[PDB]
Design a protein around this nucleic acid. Structure first.
Ligand SMILES: [Mg+2]
Ligand SMILES: [Mg+2]
Ligand SMILES: [Mg+2]
Ligand SMILES: [Mg+2]
Ligand SMILES: [Mg+2]
Ligand SMILES: [Mg+2]
Ligand SMILES: [Mg+2]
Ligand SMILES: [Mg+2]
Ligand SMILES: [Mg+2]
Ligand SMILES: [Mg+2]
Ligand SMILES: [Mg+2]
Ligand SMILES: [Mg+2]
Ligand SMILES: [Mg+2]
Ligand SMILES: [Mg+2]
Ligand SMILES: [Mg+2]
Ligand SMILES: [Mg+2]
Ligand SMILES: [Mg+2]
Ligand SMILES: [Mg+2]
Ligand SMILES: [Mg+2]
Ligand SMILES: [Mg+2]
Ligand SMILES: [Mg+2]
Ligand SMILES: [Mg+2]
Ligand SMILES: [Mg+2]
Ligand SMILES: [Mg+2]
Ligand SMILES: [Mg+2]
Ligand SMILES: [Mg+2]
Ligand SMILES: [Mg+2]
Ligand SMILES: [Mg+2]
Ligand SMILES: [Mg+2]
Ligand SMILES: [Mg+2]
Ligand SMILES: [Mg+2]
Ligand SMILES: [Mg+2]
Ligand SMILES: [Mg+2]
Ligand SMILES: [Mg+2]
Ligand SMILES: [Mg+2]
Ligand SMILES: [Mg+2]
Ligand SMILES: [Mg+2]
Ligand SMILES: [Mg+2]
Ligand SMILES: [Mg+2]
Ligand SMILES: [Mg+2]
Ligand SMILES: [Mg+2]
Lengths: 132, 311, 208, 81, 116
RNA sequence: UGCCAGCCACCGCGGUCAUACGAUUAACCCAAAUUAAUAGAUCCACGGCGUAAAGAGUGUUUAAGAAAAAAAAUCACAAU
RNA sequence: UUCGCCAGAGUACUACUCGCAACUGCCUAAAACUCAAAGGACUUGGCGGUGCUUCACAUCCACCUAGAGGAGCCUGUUCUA
RNA sequence: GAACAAUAGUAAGCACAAUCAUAGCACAUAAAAACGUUAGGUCAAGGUGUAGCUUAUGGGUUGGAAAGAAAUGGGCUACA
């Protein structure tokens, strides 16, 4: 029985995000990729760096934006700039949201020594794909 | 849920305009065919399952049909069969049986099939049981069993469908070369890592050339030359035709077989329309579906397994 | 099995196709055949329309092939047919006119004969009863019998030669001796027959 | 109920159930049937087609007359107002 | 006629002493017993024996008797086709009665009543 | 502390995370008494007897009782 | 309407008594002690060297092929060190 | 808690099935395969609840290990 990245069947009441409801064998069939970069294509270099980098930005966004994160965080790399999209729940009063926008962009840009672009799409409640 | 359909169809049209104006087409002749190209170019998802790819479509194809309101605002139900829990089914049944009865008082292989179970389920907007379906179709046989009136025939036509069947080996028109003014036919066989192309000239010396060398030299294995001989010995043309050949990939038997297929394909221009069905039943023109099977991990040979131990 | 059950076998004989016009039920039948839009198998590479193809020789050819060598088995067979041929020519020219009328010079007729003559009529199957295995007399279906003959010839001329002796030669000897019924192969067939005769009582046990 | 039975010759569920739900019940008992849960029985032959037809058309008519009379008294109600 | 059941069974009323002690209650069941598959005997045994005798007298030269042998194979083909035919024969039933499926539907249509 | 030391009227608790042991901490309830022990009062059946404990291997009579009217007809035949 | 019988389970168709053509017998028939049960019927499972039907499609049997167990070596356990 | 000439079952969900992949079909293979079961495997991938260690059950440097009486599992190469 494969336990990989899966969400078990409950008494049937458990709310589930579209992503967490689609099991590993489904990648590239229904589900998409959470990140995008050149590094894994045939002739390409430095895949590892974009992986460490990605991981750290998962943890970073989960920690800078407490309790307000909706679904897993969507990274794109385009021509040396990062485009970080987030689905974010509405909890915070908007001031704090922009505080953290500036905070994040600046901090990251100076950490990875490349320009970062941030996008928050705000959602009233976690989207429910199944059950509920 | 009907308010949703009104709203959705409105926004669908507004978004339709919005699509045309950006995509730069006349909003009038814009089709679904164009809708597809449009989204496909705007939101290019490589994804294997095609339902999970982006869609903008008329809500009717998007959403399932609904069962309408089944009772007035007094609580009182419209249809008299409502309490059967399937009105949709038993209405068809009442009507069908009525048709039958009237037929009995009055009376004193085109590729046509009955609906599937799923199609009657779509027609009545009603879940069905196998038994139920079977019952009904049985009844339609009873209907066909008697003298068929006009409205009787229309009635059973509702539940009629029609299916295509196509069998012919597709016949290439020949090709007359400009150089000698002579006719040739160029076949392509493919077997098992090996493709071959064979040009067959209609007036031969019996000459058969392979990759620029003679066929005896290129197939020192007798078996192969026999395989080659098959189509020509079949059609009794053995000396009559002159073939040029180019084959690549795989090992010798695979090659000889590819040439078999390609040749037998290029030989159906110069043969009679009747001998074609023979070459089919000889199995000459049908590819070999047989290929190597991938090893599986934790096994040996795709089938062969590591020796299993009871203790 | 990359063929679904939808794909029926090819019928490869040419005489069938060229001359239909005198046969009604067969006209009906092959009409049904292609008209059915019947998906039909790509004909095998071993089966050819060659006028020279004897299916029995093919089977026996295969059963001699170790590993994947068609080439080698083909060659050994070819050399066996050849060897018998020349050996029978040698018997012919060294003989008297009467025996010249007698002698078979066709290696093929010699082969079908030497196999017809080596095939057992009955064979044994073990039956478990009350703890013991009894070997009981079973009538056999033809193809199993053919197989038993061929298997026996091959196993016999494989096993018991002295290593300086090539296969095609010994095989030829066994073929020509089995022709005259004096060969060890037939000793084997006979030990089958005898074992069946000794156990004949037990032919009650078998229920099918 | 124009028959009180199921084709397996037990009492039809609907009897137990109507009776269970506080619905009144009017049905034709036959010599084999059990009347006791039925609100208003009519003892009588369920099997012969003249009988079924008769009972049918009668309940039919009672219905029709009730409906007509309803309509009428509604019209009179409308004139009185 | 059906054997009298009066006074047979041990009951409170009965002044007599018991006759039948049923293992299972005497009631017609709804369903019917499923068909009993028949077993086989040894097939062909005769020709087998005759052909044995032949080889015994003839010192086991198969060429000496063609007759016993060909009749033996005649029997083998009659046997095999008898098995194929008894496999497709399932329309047999009782040959004048109905297969136990039919009986069982039919019996569910006019069931037997213990209760009420 | 670790099936050890121990506890319980019944069911039970202790084998490494014990609200049952021993000791704390809070509570509970009685209270010039409180628990433990042992005797009582109380406690079966005007209920049962196919499978649960219980219809005796069988008949007749004594003793003792209970009582409207009908209550000896025949072997479908194998008591002794 | 009567009579006969039953007050947890063992202990116990037993020990002692009484009577009998029995003298390893029959009948009548306890207590110490031990336990918190002992019993009847049922319910789903599981199981069955029960019975019946239907299968096994590399699969039990019959059958086909190629190997393991023997030899050298590689390499992993288990033991001795 | 079923019988379809139907006798108390209805039910969205997750499984199977369906579709995807193996570059067109088809079959085949791949994948998938719930709920539970075996207190099955792994505190040495990592992370943790409970416990222990803290001038050491911590952290470093230098060497040293992996010998065969056998017994056996799987392979490789043979016996021509
Ligand atoms: Mg698995
Ligand atoms: Mg292999
Ligand atoms: Mg009596
Ligand atoms: Mg008695
Ligand atoms: Mg019993
Ligand atoms: Mg101890
Ligand atoms: Mg503790
Ligand atoms: Mg306590
Ligand atoms: Mg305490
Ligand atoms: Mg006091
Ligand atoms: Mg009392
Ligand atoms: Mg009772
Ligand atoms: Mg008792
Ligand atoms: Mg007692
Ligand atoms: Mg008694
Ligand atoms: Mg007495
Ligand atoms: Mg007694
Ligand atoms: Mg008196
Ligand atoms: Mg009285
Ligand atoms: Mg007692
Ligand atoms: Mg006794
Ligand atoms: Mg005694
Ligand atoms: Mg006494
Ligand atoms: Mg096997
Ligand atoms: Mg198995
Ligand atoms: Mg070996
Ligand atoms: Mg070995
Ligand atoms: Mg170790
Ligand atoms: Mg050691
Ligand atoms: Mg596809
Ligand atoms: Mg498939
Ligand atoms: Mg798998
Ligand atoms: Mg699936
Ligand atoms: Mg364990
Ligand atoms: Mg284990
Ligand atoms: Mg750890
Ligand atoms: Mg910890
Ligand atoms: Mg250290
Ligand atoms: Mg070191
Ligand atoms: Mg060994
Ligand atoms: Mg090997």
């Amino acid at each position: 029985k494969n336990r990989a990245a899966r969400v078990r069947v409950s008494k049937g009441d458990k709310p589930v995000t579209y992503e967490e409801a689609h099991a590993p064998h489904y990648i590239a069939h229904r589900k998409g990729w959470l990140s995008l970069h050149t590094g894994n294509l045939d002739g390409e270099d430095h895949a590892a760096e974009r992986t460490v980098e990605d991981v750290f930005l998962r943890k970073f966004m989960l920690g800078t934006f407490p309790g307000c994160l909706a679904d897993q965080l969507v990274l794109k790399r385009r021509a040396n700039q990062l485009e970080i999209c987030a689905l974010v729940l509405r909890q915070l009063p908007p001031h704090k949201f922009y505080f953290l926008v500036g905070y994040s962009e600046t901090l990251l840009s100076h950490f990875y020594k490349c320009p970062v672009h941030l996008h928050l799409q705000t959602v009233p409640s976690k989207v429910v794909y199944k059950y509920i | 849920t009907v308010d949703f359909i009104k709203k959705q169809i409105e926004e669908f049209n507004i978004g339709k305009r919005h699509l045309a104006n950006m995509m730069g087409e006349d909003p009038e002749t814009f089709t679904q065919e164009d809708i597809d190209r449009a989204i496909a170019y705007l939101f290019p998802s490589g994804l294997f399952e095609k339902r999970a790819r982006p869609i903008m479509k008329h809500p009717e194809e998007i959403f399932p049909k609904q069962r309408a309101i089944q009772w007035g605002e007094d609580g009182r139900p419209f249809h008299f069969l409502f309490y059967t829990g399937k009105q949709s089914y038993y209405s068809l049944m009442h009507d069908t049986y009525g048709k039958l009865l009237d037929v009995e008082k009055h009376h004193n292989p085109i590729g046509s099939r009955w609906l599937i179970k799923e199609e009657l389920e779509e027609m009545l907007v009603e879940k069905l049981s196998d038994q139920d379906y079977a019952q009904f179709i049985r009844l339609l046989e009873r209907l066909s069993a008697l003298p068929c009136g006009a409205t009787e025939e229309d009635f059973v036509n509702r539940f009629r469908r029609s299916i295509p069947x196509x069998x012919x080996x597709x016949x290439x028109x020949x090709x007359x070369x400009x150089x000698x003014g002579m006719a040739f036919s160029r076949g392509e066989g493919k077997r098992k890592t090996a493709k071959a192309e064979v040009v067959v000239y209609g007036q031969g010396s019996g000459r058969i050339d392979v990759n620029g060398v003679d066929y005896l030299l290129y197939f020192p294995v007798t078996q192969d030359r026999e395989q080659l001989m098959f189509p020509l010995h079949f059609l009794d043309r053995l000396g009559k035709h002159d073939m040029t050949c180019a084959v690549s990939g795989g090992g010798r038997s695979a090659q000889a077989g590819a040439v078999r297929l390609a040749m037998a394909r290029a030989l159906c221009s110069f043969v009679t329309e009747d001998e074609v069905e023979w070459m089919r039943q000889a199995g000459l023109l049908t590819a070999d579906p047989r290929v190597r099977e991938r090893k599986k991990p934790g096994q040996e040979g795709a089938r062969r397994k590591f020796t299993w131990k009871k203790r | 099995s990359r063929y679904g059950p939808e794909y029926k076998d090819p019928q490869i004989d040419k005489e069938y196709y060229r001359k239909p016009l005198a046969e009604q039920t067969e006209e009906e039948k092959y009409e049904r055949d292609f008209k059915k839009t019947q998906l039909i198998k790509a004909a095998p590479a071993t089966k050819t329309s060659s006028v020279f193809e004897d299916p029995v020789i093919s089977k026996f050819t295969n059963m001699m092939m170790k590993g994947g060598n068609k080439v080698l088995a083909r060659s050994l067979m070819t050399q066996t047919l050849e060897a018998v041929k020349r050996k029978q020519f040698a018997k012919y020219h060294a003989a008297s006119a009467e025996e010249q009328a007698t002698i078979e010079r066709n290696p093929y007729t010699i082969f079908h004969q030497a196999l017809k003559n080596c095939e057992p009529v009955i064979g044994l199957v073990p039956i478990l009863k009350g703890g013991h295995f009894y070997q009981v007399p079973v009538p056999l279906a033809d193809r199993r019998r053919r197989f038993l003959a061929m298997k026996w010839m091959i196993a016999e001329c494989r096993e018991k030669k002295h290593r300086r002796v090539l296969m095609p030669e010994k095989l030829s000897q066994e073929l020509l001796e089995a022709f005259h019924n004096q060969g060890p192969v037939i000793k084997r067939k006979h030990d089958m027959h005898k074992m069946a005769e000794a156990n004949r009582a037990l032919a009650h046990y078998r229920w099918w | 109920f124009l028959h009180t039975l199921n084709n397996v010759f037990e009492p039809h569920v609907a009897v137990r159930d109507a009776a269970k739900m506080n619905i009144p019940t009017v049905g034709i008992v036959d010599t084999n049937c059990n009347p006791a849960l039925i609100t208003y029985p009519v003892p009588g032959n369920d099997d012969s087609p003249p009988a079924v037809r008769l009972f049918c058309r009668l309940f039919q008519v009672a219905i029709s007359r009730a409906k007509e009379k309803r309509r009428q008294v509604e019209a009179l109600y409308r004139l009185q107002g | 006629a059906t054997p009298s059941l009066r006074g047979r069974l041990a009951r409170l009323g009965n002044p007599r002493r018991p006759i039948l002690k049923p293992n299972k209650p005497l009631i017609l069941a709804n369903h019917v017993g499923e068909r009993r598959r028949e077993k086989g005997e040894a097939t062909c045994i005769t020709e087998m024996s005759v052909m044995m005798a032949c080889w015994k007298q003839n010192e086991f030269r198969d060429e000496a008797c063609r007759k016993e042998i060909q009749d033996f194979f005649d029997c083998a083909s009659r046997a095999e086709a008898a098995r194929k035919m008894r496999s497709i024969q399932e329309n047999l039933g009782e040959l004048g009665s109905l297969p136990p499926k039919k009986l069982n539907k039919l019996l569910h249509r006019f069931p037997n009543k213990p209760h009420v």
